[PDB]
Paper text:
The crystal structures of TMPRSS2 and CTSL/CTSB in complex with the potent inhibitors were determined to reveal their specific mode of interaction.
As a result, two inhibitors, K777 and E64d were identified with an IC50 value of 5.43 and 88.85 nM for CTSL, and 174.30 and 244.26 nM for CTSB. Significantly, E64d has been used as a clinical drug to treat Alzheimer’s disease. To explore the inhibition mechanism of K777 and E64d, we determined the crystal structures of these compounds bound to human CTSL and CTSB. In the structure of CTSL in complex with E64d, E64d is covalently linked to the γS atom of Cys25. In addition, this inhibitor fills the S1-S3 subsites, forming five hydrogen bonds with the side chain of Gln19 and the backbone amide of Cys25, Asp162, and Gly68. This might be explained by the narrower S2 subsite to accommodate the smaller isobutyl group since Asp160, Met161, Asp162, and Ala214 form a continuous steric hindrance barrier in the CTSL to prevent S2 subsite extension. Aside from this major difference, E64d has an almost identical mode of binding at S1 subsite in both CTSL and CTSB. K777 and E64d, as endocytosis-mediated entrance pathway inhibitors, could effectively reduce the infectivity of the SARS-CoV-2 Omicron BA.2 variant in Calu-3 cells with an EC50 value of 14.0 nM (Selectivity index (SI) = 7,829, SI is calculated as the ratio of CC50 value against EC50 value, a common measurement for comparing cytotoxicity and antiviral potency of compounds) and 239.8 nM (SI > 4,000).
Numbering used by the authors: 1 to 175, 177 to 220
The structure:
Amino acid sequence: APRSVDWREKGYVTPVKNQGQCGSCWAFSATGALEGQMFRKTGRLISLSEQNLVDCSGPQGNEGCNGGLMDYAFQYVQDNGGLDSEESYPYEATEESCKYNPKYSVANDTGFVDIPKQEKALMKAVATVGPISVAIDAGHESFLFYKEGIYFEPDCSSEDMDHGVLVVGYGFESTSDNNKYWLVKNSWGEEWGMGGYVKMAKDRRNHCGIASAASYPTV
Ligand SMILES: *[C@@H](C(=O)OCC)[C@H](O)C(=O)N[C@@H](CC(C)C)C(=O)NCCC(C)C
């Protein structure tokens, strides 16, 4: 695997979005990964509807603004046979009745792959697949008010993950102990962190659980 990967450099990643006051992180992490795989497949980068997932993927186990899972979202897209564009079904930060329209479907997937729960397995996936949906422990004020640099929270849990985000690459901080990081796309707007991104400690014992719930859709 390469020592450094950053899929934003190759056009795989839409601009940072903002979930607002809705527990819909799972939907944004899911659209992020599917946007990456659809771009690899077609060469077209098209923003996808988190609202479609919020309103319609209840049968697969998601709960709208009361949470969900990226794998459930990938299953909905497979079950449903498509997912609408962001443009045609824009984000509302509240759940309403399902309004999926196949006429505006711009994506599909055939399932998903759950990655083994090891950071080096996550590294290979990021290097060979593209952006990867992951779960992290985001429940600390150090993370809420994160500004820049490599985030490391000694109290972070590797099993109490609560926030779905997107790993778009990894790297190392030039000038050899605790220098590696994951490049993570968050869904809290472009003002949060580093243009919406956070560098999360890598190879420091699965910090904040980043490798415990990693997955991507198959297209
Ligand atoms: C994520 C979120 O929006 O928090 C940022 C404020 C949601 O809380 C959420 O869906 N969390 C989720 C696990 C993530 C995807 C790692 C969860 O708790 N799922 C179980 C709840 C059930 C509705 C599936």
